[PDB]
Symmetry: C3
């Protein structure tokens, strides 16, 4: 399985995207929380509150998920970071597999 | 070293479990913070407040830690995700190894 | 690219360090959010509030970043954890590469 990290400008866009991903069963679930972001943007160090999102899905769904997020994401240049899970309890993995598209 | 991510329904259980893992020295440290979880429950997409926990320990203690978490976790099918640390400052790693069980 | 996780005792130090890392272009961006820490410290389980920081930068900048964080960080033995990103959307990657020093 893998985890994907992305950020949103606010909660409305975040939940909208996440729910769409769940309805299409491209992810088994997501953990969202706010954070203070500091980043470079066109010669300036911007500061802004964001909603960070941790998504859980299968490895074979990675490409389809990334492409789907690029279509739904409010940011023109969003972060879609994949981090593989080295291991996980079997019961949870089976659940994640059952919850995602066939 | 490795990081282990799991979630709890509340702070009581989260701290109780983490302090127990610390006491038995299965981990050297934990970071706890709330988040909003989204997943399928009862044929509907549910949103639920949780306490996420990031645990830090050694790779060789993974299996034992995983089993221990299963025995103590309040959820019936908790997420016990292992993510290997690619690199880290070695004075911190020395500390982590020294604080964990033989 | 890589993700670097570190923690700070307060917002003042976290913001100061992160802004310097950004002005030196050792990182393209940072996400700061609070958490409660539980860890072993010389025979006792300590409890402390912290500001966790997720840093994003290029792999080749890892060594230099770790060294700079070490020189700036308020903790004597801070956590500077590196997790490699298995994959990411190229357009986002280009932005991150462009904003970090050559
Ligand atoms: Na990895
Ligand atoms: Na909501």
């Amino acid at each position: 399985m893998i985890i994907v990290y992305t950020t949103f400008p606010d909660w409305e866009s975040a939940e909208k995207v996440v729910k769409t991903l769940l309805k299409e069963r491209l992810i088994a679930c997501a953990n969202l929380r706010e954070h203070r972001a500091f980043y470079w943007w066109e010669g300036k160090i911007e500061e802004d509150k964001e909603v960070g999102a941790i998504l859980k899905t299968r490895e074979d769904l990675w490409e389809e998920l990334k492409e789907r997020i690029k279509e739904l994401h409010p940011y023109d240049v969003p972060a879609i970071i994949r981090i593989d899970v080295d291991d996980v309890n079997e019961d949870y993995l089976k659940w994640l597999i059952e919850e995602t598209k066939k």
